[PDB]
Ligand binder design. Structure first.
Ligand SMILES: [Cl-]
Ligand SMILES: [Cl-]
Length: 162
């Protein structure tokens, strides 16, 4: 299992613009298009992102390209972040995948905001971090996916995904 396969499980794959859990216009593999209520602002963003007139639909390939850019951006964001970088450096390979997952879903700013949990992770206090991470809107809004991520963080194995 790797970060790509992990995220592909968590986000799914959709070739047509759709609304995410929060109601935002998304496409492909968890690629947020816009927080604007306009399906037209979404189509516009989509066309800009793809470099062609899509009329709200893309191919597998296109979705995969967005996905590759997104994980890359996710990783570079972590490494550029003064709050996140140290945590990441301190982690093993599995846990790193878990933080990348969170960052992809909630943005760098968002994760950087979980001050307490980041401190616990850095101290390798796994169980406690797991407990604190669950006290969040994130967890309450998307409980099954959050539990999977949190389990990966607590254990350092890919069990939740197998
Ligand atoms: Cl883009
Ligand atoms: Cl969920």
């Amino acid at each position: 299992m790797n970060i790509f396969e992990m995220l592909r499980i968590d986000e799914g794959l959709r070739l047509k613009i759709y609304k995410d859990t929060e109601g935002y216009y998304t496409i492909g593999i968890g690629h947020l298009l816009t927080k604007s209520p306009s399906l037209n602002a979404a189509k516009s963003e989509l066309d800009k992102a793809i470099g062609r007139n899509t009329n709200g639909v893309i191919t597998k390939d296109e979705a995969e390209k967005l996905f590759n850019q997104d994980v890359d951006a996710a990783v570079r964001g972590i490494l550029r972040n003064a709050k996140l970088k140290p945590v990441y450096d301190s982690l093993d390979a599995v846990r790193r995948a878990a933080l990348i997952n969170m960052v992809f879903q909630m943005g760098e700013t968002g994760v950087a905001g979980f001050t307490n949990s980041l401190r616990m992770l850095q101290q390798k206090r796994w169980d406690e971090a797991a407990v604190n991470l669950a006290k969040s809107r994130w967890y309450n809004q998307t409980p099954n996916r959050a539990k999977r991520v949190i389990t990966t963080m607590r254990t350092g194995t890919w069990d939740a995904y197998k």
